[PDB]
Write a protein that binds this ligand. Sequence first.
Ligand SMILES: Nc1ncnc2c1ncn2[C@@H]1O[C@H](COP(=O)(O)OP(=O)(O)NP(=O)(O)O)[C@@H](O)[C@H]1O
Ligand SMILES: Nc1ncnc2c1ncn2[C@@H]1O[C@H](COP(=O)(O)OP(=O)(O)NP(=O)(O)O)[C@@H](O)[C@H]1O
Ligand SMILES: CCCc1cc(=O)oc2c(C(=O)N3CCCc4ccccc43)c(OCCO)ccc12
Ligand SMILES: CCCc1cc(=O)oc2c(C(=O)N3CCCc4ccccc43)c(OCCO)ccc12
Ligand SMILES: [Mg+2]
Ligand SMILES: [Mg+2]
Lengths: 388, 388
Amino acid sequence: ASVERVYQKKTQLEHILLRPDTYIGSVEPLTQFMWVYDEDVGMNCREVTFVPGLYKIFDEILVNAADNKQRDKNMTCIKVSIDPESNIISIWNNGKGIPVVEHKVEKVYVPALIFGQLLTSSNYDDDEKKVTGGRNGYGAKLCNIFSTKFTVETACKEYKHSFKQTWMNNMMKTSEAKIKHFDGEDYTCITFQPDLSKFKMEKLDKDIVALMTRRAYDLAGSCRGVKVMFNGKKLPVNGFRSYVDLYVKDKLDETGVALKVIHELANERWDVCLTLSEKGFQQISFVNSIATTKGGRHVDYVVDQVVGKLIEVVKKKNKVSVKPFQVKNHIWVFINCLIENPTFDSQTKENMTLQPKSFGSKCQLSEKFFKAASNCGIVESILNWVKF
Amino acid sequence: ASVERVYQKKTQLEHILLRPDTYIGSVEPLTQFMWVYDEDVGMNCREVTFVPGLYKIFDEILVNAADNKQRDKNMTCIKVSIDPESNIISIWNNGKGIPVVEHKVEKVYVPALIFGQLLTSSNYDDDEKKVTGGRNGYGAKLCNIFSTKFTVETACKEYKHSFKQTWMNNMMKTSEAKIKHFDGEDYTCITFQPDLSKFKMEKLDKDIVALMTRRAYDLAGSCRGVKVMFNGKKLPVNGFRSYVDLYVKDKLDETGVALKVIHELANERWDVCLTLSEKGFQQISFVNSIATTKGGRHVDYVVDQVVGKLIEVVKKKNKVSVKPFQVKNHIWVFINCLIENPTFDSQTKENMTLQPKSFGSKCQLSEKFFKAASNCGIVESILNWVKF
Ligand SMILES: Nc1ncnc2c1ncn2[C@@H]1O[C@H](COP(=O)(O)OP(=O)(O)NP(=O)(O)O)[C@@H](O)[C@H]1O
Ligand SMILES: Nc1ncnc2c1ncn2[C@@H]1O[C@H](COP(=O)(O)OP(=O)(O)NP(=O)(O)O)[C@@H](O)[C@H]1O
Ligand SMILES: CCCc1cc(=O)oc2c(C(=O)N3CCCc4ccccc43)c(OCCO)ccc12
Ligand SMILES: CCCc1cc(=O)oc2c(C(=O)N3CCCc4ccccc43)c(OCCO)ccc12
Ligand SMILES: [Mg+2]
Ligand SMILES: [Mg+2]
């Protein structure tokens, strides 16, 4: 091999296709025990086989829709459609559209800039302490790159125009946008056909559909004031507590007693539910409507408070050593939070790494909550073990 | 705010400084209970306060040195030097240098291309099934960008020249490389002054030095056939088993009995040690001399085998239900492995996501190992709990 074959330089776009894992996660199948929303049983936990990168290109568009609630607090609705037979996914939102106007620096229409060029964002000025999920200026381009067809439609009454442009072949082909007069109610609709060959798949199968469907339920639970429709039907989730009910309302502990679920809305930015776990520590958490599936400092911040109080309660009855990991072993926690300018260690945003002092808010759980937590079976489980 | 202030485009280099977290990890301090190598006590586990991004720019250069063992199996030595007073870190290695020659496509000297331009690598051709840690073509440029001064020195007898070039001010300033006749023993030496202002630090303090020192011990344990010196003294670690001894040789279980440590070199590519944990699941693992501090599929692959066998052993004595998470709760596992073309979800490479079928090798632990594992106190801990 010559010097020129050994030492190589890649463009940004080449690098994304060669090294997808740091952008969208694995492009190979994964089997994981997790929660999905199935057609036959609804919410359930089971082994699911899916390609993480395909989940993530969908998630990028879904979180972008949720983010529009921050640009326009009047937004009320996100509509998700998935058709496996045609391989078409669409995500529609109301509230303000994207300005249909030429960017005076980049000399392209704003929607074409921010959906068709890498490293483009409205989230790069951190002096604005935003609680959007978007931070990096990649997500929508990543979906475009991993799609055989990707269509952006947006309508903005302030600029009196609508915009429609389609990209094809992994963002490598496009044509002139259609610009039309518009004076109605604003919306944005992203419609894409994922490039299943990039994921070694033949079709959107039941497992990936059940995971994408569950993310729509997550959003109905996490994004305050936004209703969610899936395949033309409103999702019957109206807030985080009703979302948590999908997991715990019909569940018993191993002794046959219904799980006792405690809840506190500490403030507008923090919603916490807690119950007993009998299968080790479990967390379900969202930051700015992102599913933080590896947790992060927001989970540790809430859990450490509970662990500290419950160690106190146990000690007032343990006349040996109860270590924090033993208490955490019995916690199932659910968190929905809004964090200013969050940081994560990857574009996939599974682990939120911002320190609590920078969150922009606190979640000081009340003494009422801690009293209730001392009665949900965790303390009992610990004390029974202080006999062994 | 105008359209042009709201919607912004960044260059790759601007994006790295604005969004460092996905490239090097957090640039804010973190406190974590972990292992470091201190001047007073050696290897120990304690709360450590450090900035992850500073750890990682050092790690990128250290792993690049280890990677040279794959380009030249005759390499024998890596030398690490850290001087807090002068703020100078150097990492030196022998074995083949970098070709001191003009790249015929990029029209620059090879060392200047691969240390001074983003997305440059000898690891972009995956038809070569390499067990280097390098994959993405960023690491050395990230260290350069986060340094106030960054010097590359390399000497390559095949090309009969040595090369020395210095960058300054976060890779924004450089000058003509010094090229000289060379006919001696090849080496590469990277010397840098980290830009502590990027990490809100005044000096390389004892905690970061203790972590960087420990990574040198890790390398002495993980990189087969390479001796490591730190600040002019050889590290007395000669393989993975002697490295593991730094953690377990002087440790007792809670009942006062020395930890029983089991070991198997399954093949050249897999070294595994196992003992009892009394503080929940613990793993120490390396992939291609990277510390996989969030684990990954290589950890799960080994642990699942042990868990499966130990559940069998317990059952042959449990005439209730013992779940895998309960067995894993008592495992402390140490893994050193070589994986072909590994994938990770972040440039920081904390979590290795490649599926076992793609590893390029297997680690089928022997029946002798599983018998020994049934005697290291894990089974006993589980059975004692089958009474409660
Ligand atoms: N549904 C939408 N409605 C309005 N604006 C949108 C919508 N989707 C995307 N945008 C805009 O398009 C920009 C680019 O989106 P995207 O590529 O996902 O980057 P991002 O969301 O800012 N950051 P990230 O997702 O972390 O890579 C965003 O910053 C928004 O300004
Ligand atoms: N000590 C060294 N000796 C020889 N070659 C080196 C050394 N350090 C770096 N290189 C070369 O420089 C290239 C660039 O290094 P780097 O920027 O770290 O990228 P990488 O190691 O290939 N991938 P990554 O570390 O995952 O971003 C490597 O691919 C090697 O070819
Ligand atoms: C590579 C993508 C991994 C992933 C995506 C996802 O979408 O979900 C997950 C859940 C999960 O099912 N959920 C439910 C609601 C969203 C969520 C947030 C945080 C943690 C878990 C979850 C999960 O669960 C394990 C058992 O708990 C584990 C992993 C995931
Ligand atoms: C953001 C950087 C985090 C990190 C770096 C590091 O360097 O180490 C760590 C260790 C650790 O101390 N070690 C020892 C040897 C290297 C290693 C590999 C895998 C897991 C752990 C470790 C650790 O430990 C927790 C208690 O176990 C936890 C975290 C780290
Ligand atoms: Mg986005
Ligand atoms: Mg490297």
